[PDB]
Amino acid sequence: NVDMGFEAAVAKKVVVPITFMVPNRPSGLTQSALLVAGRTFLINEHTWSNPSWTSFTIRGEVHTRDEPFQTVHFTHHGVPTDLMMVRLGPGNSFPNNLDKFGLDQMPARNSRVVGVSASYGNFFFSGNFLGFVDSITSDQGTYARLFRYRVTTYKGWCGSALVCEAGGVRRIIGLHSAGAAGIGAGTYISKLGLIKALKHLGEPLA
Amino acid sequence: QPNVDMGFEAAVAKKVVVPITFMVPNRPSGLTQSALLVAGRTFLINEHTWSNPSWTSFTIRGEVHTRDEPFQTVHFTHHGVPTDLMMVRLGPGNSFPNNLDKFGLDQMPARNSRVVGVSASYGNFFFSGNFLGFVDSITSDQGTYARLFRYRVTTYKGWCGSALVCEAGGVRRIIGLHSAGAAGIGAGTYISKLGLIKALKHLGEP
């Protein structure tokens, strides 16, 4: 059987556009973000820690850099991952998407990864699971705890959710980080990691 | 070896190519691609983008324009077949640079001469690859566009509108506006200097 229900739910409830403004580019640069629960979302650390942006819009809400953001950075054995959780101030609640994240088993090589993106309209991308990697090093530095997939991607697609399959269950276990030469890389997401981050940020649901 | 000189591409990035962001009901922060400032209050944009019925406003050069404004437009055809190229004249406002002298080649580029794409679609950036030749038309499931040329570059959706700088007879100028790509091969619509002149007079530009 082929079933698109889980992907459609991720597109409907989880993945949303996020646009970051820097002085002299008021139109901003849009990518994707993942709504987790309450007022917390997942975003690439590379995007968030960039010192250039002065504001961003998510869910049609404009947020300036001086807002008192609570954030959690995910590391692995101390090595940075390209994953951050951000809690906005009080406001309209996000859906509770926590049950859409996490696999207890590892996807097989050449199982299908489905990316769910809101980075230029809503769209899907998909390719073979190529395996986990302890870390990837670019000219700009080192990120830990990723997995790769065989699909051509564009850096604007950062933040797209990565749905994988293991032991007959399909869930989000990744957020798209980068890609080159037809091979994309996404940062791994664990359910317990999310629970820890949510409690640190003060969210009641976990 | 021949000297390498980036002055022309740098001037095109500085004066010609700008972001344009089209708003649709699903996207308050909209979908950004490139547009080419020609002269006065006129710019070049893809017909496919402009004719899309979904958008309710666009932003260019900091100005917000709603679809109800009385835009003067010219659609470029070739033997009556549509090309993916339109010139739009905005209402009165701050003048664009006079970039007319940056467009047009009187000779055809050679195969595997370099095409340089100049884009404002995700920040300012350059792409580049081999000139693959003119084609009389290209037909997709959505229909037929005429008077294109192709280049060996992987491109993405929002790169539409990027300027294509080519070389012929020892001269380098803009002769294309990026249309679409696939399978590592991009396609752009040809731009003729006289075509621009004809359009500028039809739209009432001095």
Automatic annotation (TrEMBL), chain A:
Classify the source by domain of life.
Viruses
Instruction: Identify the stretch annotated as signal peptide in this record.
Output: none
| Compartments reported by the entry | Host cytoplasmic vesicle membrane; Host nucleus, Host nucleolus; Virion
Domain annotation Peptidase C3: ranges: 1-194
The membrane spanning regions, by residue number, are none
The record describes the protein's role as: VP0 precursor is a component of immature procapsids.
Q: What is this protein called?
A: Genome polyprotein
